[PDB]
Write a protein that binds this ligand. Sequence first.
Ligand SMILES: [Mg+2]
Lengths: 243, 243
Amino acid sequence: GMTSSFTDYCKFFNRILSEVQETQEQAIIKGAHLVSEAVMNGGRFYVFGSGHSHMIAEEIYNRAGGLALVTAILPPELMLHERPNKSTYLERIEGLSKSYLKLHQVTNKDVIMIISNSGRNTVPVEMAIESRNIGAKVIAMTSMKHSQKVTSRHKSGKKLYEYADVVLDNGAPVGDAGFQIANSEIYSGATSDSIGCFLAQALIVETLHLLVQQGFEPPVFKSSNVDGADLYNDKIFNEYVKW
Amino acid sequence: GMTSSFTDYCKFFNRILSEVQETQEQAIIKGAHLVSEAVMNGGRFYVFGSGHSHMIAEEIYNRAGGLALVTAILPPELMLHERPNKSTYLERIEGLSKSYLKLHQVTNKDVIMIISNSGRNTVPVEMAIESRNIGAKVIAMTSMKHSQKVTSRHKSGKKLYEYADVVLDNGAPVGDAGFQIANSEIYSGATSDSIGCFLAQALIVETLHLLVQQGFEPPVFKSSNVDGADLYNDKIFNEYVKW
Ligand SMILES: [Mg+2]
């Protein structure tokens, strides 16, 4: 009768996560220094991704344990829900990222994290370029494997990682679907968002640690089950959230 | 802990992930049977979550390694980007899920996965009730710890997991921000989405594995780096993607 892929997929996943945990500590720390420095300087933390990568922006925005100084840049035209494949077309268009930075009034006091697995398209690369132009620090989350292997589709000829102050490597294999289904040529089990979400939280957790060590009391959304969560959350929403 | 939280956060996280992997295998297998049987019987796999939970639907929808018979139900009004807190309010409203189900013409041949940490609010509970009433199979992804501790806000006085054919436990602690920022009262490091994504992926992998074993050749999107990826993808999109 039928066998199970679960043990195998767990092992596949756990290796990637191990390697990530083992190799990204220094990056996480340097990224957290960038973010904490910005916060302490009156700055914000902008987060952006295109396609599926946008979920890492969502992940650290407006939730329990969430730093209220985080603003997700979430253009729905680059998401998944308006029409299938729309975001694939738009990712190639020059001038979008620059408009977005303008709309959100990102300044040189700020930090931005840009998530892209391949880091090869116009939108994410432009976002890094225009951010540098503004003078904001850039964190890139990416698949260093995938991205090193691909050719830029941005006019610079460069990739996202090549414009970052700090790179966070999600460890995803080239393709982001690297688990081969037994007795077939079918590949699945993408790791970029699971591991990407882990890393995004680790960054925030590290940032908060750095702030606390320094005697900064950062605005962080309390989970409903803590006493007085709501009144506190309403207070800090009002004082802090920029969308 | 003195300077960095990263090692501690990894341990914290790996603990939860280990527990999830140690315990959810039978539930993964059961869910994959539901989905694989539906697929072979002319059905689809719908996926839905409110608030941050929506990203789990996104995760297995329209992507490399993705099963083309997955349709995410993604009402923007219950996402994060329109305005802050809108999803929180709307999740408590009667009648939305019944509309969504109609709009997506969900039928008795299908399966639906509903993701909610607490599983206590009207939207996900109403969705679960109506989906079984139609005749669909229901998979719930929830935090069993959180869900069991809280009272239901739905008029039936029951919770999401109580209405599902299979439950996936994301292992998240009550409140979903359980990691203490060393030597403060600040808590962070939400795990429901990182672990949630891994679970969604494990389910699909297992579903594909069951299908291949039964000689069914499923439509799975190929990644960019694969030969013929784009034609094949257009083909299966055209044949299968409903939205
Ligand atoms: Mg999303």
